[PDB]
Amino acid sequence: ISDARANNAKTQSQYQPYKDAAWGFINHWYPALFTHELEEDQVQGIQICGVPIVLRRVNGKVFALKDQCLHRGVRLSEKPTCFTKSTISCWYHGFTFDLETGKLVTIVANPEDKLIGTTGVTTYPVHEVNGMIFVFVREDDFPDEDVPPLAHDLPFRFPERSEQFPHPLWPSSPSVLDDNAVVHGMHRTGFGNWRIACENGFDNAHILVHKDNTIVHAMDWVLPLGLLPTSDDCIAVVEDDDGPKGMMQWLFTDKWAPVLENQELGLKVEGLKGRHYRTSVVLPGVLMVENWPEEHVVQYEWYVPITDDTHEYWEILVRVCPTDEDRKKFQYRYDHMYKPLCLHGFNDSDLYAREAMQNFYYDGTGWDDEQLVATDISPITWRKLASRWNRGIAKPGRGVAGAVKDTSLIFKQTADGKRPGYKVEQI
Amino acid sequence: ISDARANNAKTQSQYQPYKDAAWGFINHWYPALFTHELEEDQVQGIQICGVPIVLRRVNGKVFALKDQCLHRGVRLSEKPTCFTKSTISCWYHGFTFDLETGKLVTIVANPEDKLIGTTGVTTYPVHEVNGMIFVFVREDDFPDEDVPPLAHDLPFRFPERSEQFPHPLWPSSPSVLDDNAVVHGMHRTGFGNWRIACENGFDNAHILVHKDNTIVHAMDWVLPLGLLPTSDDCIAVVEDDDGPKGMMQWLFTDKWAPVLENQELGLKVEGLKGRHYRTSVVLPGVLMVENWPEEHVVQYEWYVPITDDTHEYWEILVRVCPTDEDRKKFQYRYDHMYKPLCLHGFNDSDLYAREAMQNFYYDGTGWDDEQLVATDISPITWRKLASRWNRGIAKPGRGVAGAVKDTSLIFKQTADGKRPGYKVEQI
Amino acid sequence: ISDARANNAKTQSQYQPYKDAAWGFINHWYPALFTHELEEDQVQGIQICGVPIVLRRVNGKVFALKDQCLHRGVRLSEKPTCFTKSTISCWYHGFTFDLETGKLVTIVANPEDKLIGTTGVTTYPVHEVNGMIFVFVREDDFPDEDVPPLAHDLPFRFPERSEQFPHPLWPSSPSVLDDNAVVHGMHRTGFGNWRIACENGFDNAHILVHKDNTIVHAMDWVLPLGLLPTSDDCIAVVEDDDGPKGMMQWLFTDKWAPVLENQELGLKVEGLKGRHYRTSVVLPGVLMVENWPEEHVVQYEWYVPITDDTHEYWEILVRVCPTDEDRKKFQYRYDHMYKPLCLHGFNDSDLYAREAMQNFYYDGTGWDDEQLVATDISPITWRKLASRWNRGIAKPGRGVAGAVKDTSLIFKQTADGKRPGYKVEQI
């Protein structure tokens, strides 16, 4: 371990909370499911920050409660059982909860029990917009009054912030919150801790991972070895009360210079063909790549913690489509261009790169022994702001799936060929 | 956690031993194998309460010894090797043991070693009757003269106890011990702790789990939401020296009233069609369902601890068949009725309901945080009597299969598609 | 536990370091790959003694470095990336290391970083000879000038030591170091600790394991029950400075007598049909079986530790083949004789016998509770010499594959059907 590494003792002491958040930052908004994954009267169970959550759509509205019956702890989502439009019941002994408040309103075959009405399950705020269902995953005692607006946990919006973050080389990126904004993408389980997966996206030295991607050569791009920071303010940290807490990297300005050569090895690039884009990241860990893969289109990624060693990776492309025809154009270009070359292919390289780094950090070794360099100003800056502004550190799961990693149940599922997952299997 | 729950501090303190028995209650009789699973000269390895056991039938008689060579700990049952009618040898280095006493009588290629005769492996009493081989799984130092009769660990017998447990609505249920009693059924490995699997069988509020079973609607039954206790003595606890230690639930009497409605949800049943039956459980955890699925037939269930998170679930139907004709009719009805609709179908629902609850309890959370209600007088009563009358608490396995849950051998087997099991695979 | 067992307290205290070496003996030579497994410009990752290692052949020469980028710990071997003949780069962020010294010579897209040249990854000495690539797996601080010659970690050589270890009944066994010595064989991952796999090879009481092997009855052999030591010097321990550290068993002399009968079981052999051979073992745990399976042919086995519960089992046959014709005869006899009847068949029996013993020892139980006998003078003598002459005890892996056994990555791979392994999968 060299003394020339950027993550020295003082620097590391600045992001201890981050090192302690293996299970994720709780009391934040996270994408839960795509609208198409939850139809009218459909019930679905998931897990975020170690918290089991069940969702149901009733009369067009989505509700979210803890997927844990308070009687004997089974998941309510394994066998969806709802007798009324305003409740969800446990299929085992009939404990029935109010969708709106989560209160135990009754017990199917024991309507007069003294336990009724004296307790209930945790509820989770839901915000569905333009094809996506977001859920505010919170601790049991986080007050309703303190729940912030979804926007506070989403990337910086444009043109709203075009003056704060000038972007003369490309038109404004749309937000999932914008009217007529259309979302195309997917989410799948990533194997490894969410933090390590999150840090890859805005790292300007990992470009090497994409050197051989097909889209790179199909688009005749002659990529740069990487990007180097040239000044101390190459990244802007934003932490105002009203708004997202995160950072913006001044890519395509002189604060970040592209590298073309290496005299040792003897490498040197002389074809400056490429794309104009910009990355930023905000709590709870949302990446935004402006002007990617093309103008008017933007890519967003989430690394939702499920347990301390799995996460649900989201990858979407957004574009505002005012007319029925605009939607068809975007759907078409996604289907025959974006999805096969960008989401699959370009990003697949990121997928395995993240996994390859997990072993170094899981038992704690990497958080101490990693030897960061100049380009690592990016993850380091992120860790510090995340440590300062997170709304809570999730506690390890207890008495839920994922609390114990080597149960006979898990070996059974594994024997049957099932990998660690996210969506609860039913029946 | 509501103060209105039945399992308060005082109640919980009354079943600490039960909370401590994850590996099972040792020094008890357990069904090991069906007679048809062990033919003349056949050797089979199994595991109960964490204890590896090997059985062999010689001249019609079954013997059981610890499936662990005292030399270097391999399982004797993996490659059956017996040179004489009175012994079983280890296929590795030849240590040979007397089937009757378990003494080390010799070593194939080292007949004069001084270790010979100075030690041996543990023996386990066997009791085979009407198609079933029972084994008294005991600690290494439990004395032979202290082994109790099998009947002490089997359900209450009728008509012997018909006066103690009146049953005017149905004929007496037969015992596996009765002459001409015929057994039909099966046992399979269940994933999760034995205690949680055991408590489901006699719970009168889980009826909801069967609301959709095919047999229920094929037999025009209009089930009750559940059953509620009406008096403090709705369950009779029996604990006399000579006899089984357990409890009898006074089903189909004043003490247990069927629930027909729930005003909150607006539910209400008006078709009282069903079956007459009665459940009781005795240590080590044997369920008896009288008059099920039909008169003169009785169902018995065991949840034999294998390790602390797997158990062997037994499900059998018994009926006395004095003549060859009676046996054919019972075999036929089992094959084309009981098996497909009852053992499979009705009980399969219980199988998955048990599993769904295991995660809440494995790490200990559920044993403290569960919020039991009125109908839970059943499991609570069982945990108390079990705590008071068990003949021992099995210690965790050491140096045996299951002692460690994440060995490379287990990952290899899992990769090959093999789930956690019970019967040792040979060769 | 009987007091008549050979491994009494005093004896056990003589091999504590061996009990402590679950991860293996480090600072020793080990077979890494067969020459055919690493062609010109090919890169391959492996793991020995918990240490991740990557090899590459350049201009005919093989180099080995630690398969762990010092930046953020990914394995360099997962996506082979080399820009020059004298280096190997990390495919993630471009850290580049010198093959010869392991020094960090540059960073592709950050050639001026202050970290460059101030550190590097560990290098491992390589000795390739007659088809086998050996690697000196050492601790990070083991001096280059202290690396001993490969021969010190290889079995005793003949005729060099024919006078020291007289063998009138068979011609001298060739060494992998001999000119024109040809190697044929294979290595595969073994499931369980290396020590338990290693001790089986030179045990003279496990002969029973091969009683049914096809080659035994195809060769009309009437095997002995086993062999017993007759004198205290039945094993010669060698520990001179210049040379291998190990032991030679005086098989086929009166110090080891074959057993023909067992009066207790009534067994007795009358047909002394067999083969002449002799076993010896040297650190780090290499077996040599002289005159096996035929004259002029010798079998060597390694049990290379990968982690503390997996090892790479090597099984090779060596014969000196001066002419092109001699090589074809050996290749032929291996292909249609040795491989099918000896490597597979005879040795497959040893493979499963080793596995069956692993559970007793992994949690520590067996290392204390095993009850060894007279024939165990063999493993006991080996444990003592190993404890005394090992060049170091490998420390548990940290921040590398194998450091944590139940990661979601391991469950993913297992779910996909992949067993624990050795060679790193690429892409």
Ligand code: FES
């Ligand atoms: S576990 Fe849900 S009602 Fe009993």
Ligand code: FES
């Ligand atoms: S392990 Fe059984 S005789 Fe050696």
Ligand code: FES
């Ligand atoms: S992990 Fe290897 S260069 Fe970053």
Ligand SMILES: [Fe+3]
């Ligand atoms: Fe990338």
Ligand SMILES: [Fe+3]
């Ligand atoms: Fe049931």
Ligand SMILES: [Fe+3]
């Ligand atoms: Fe052998």
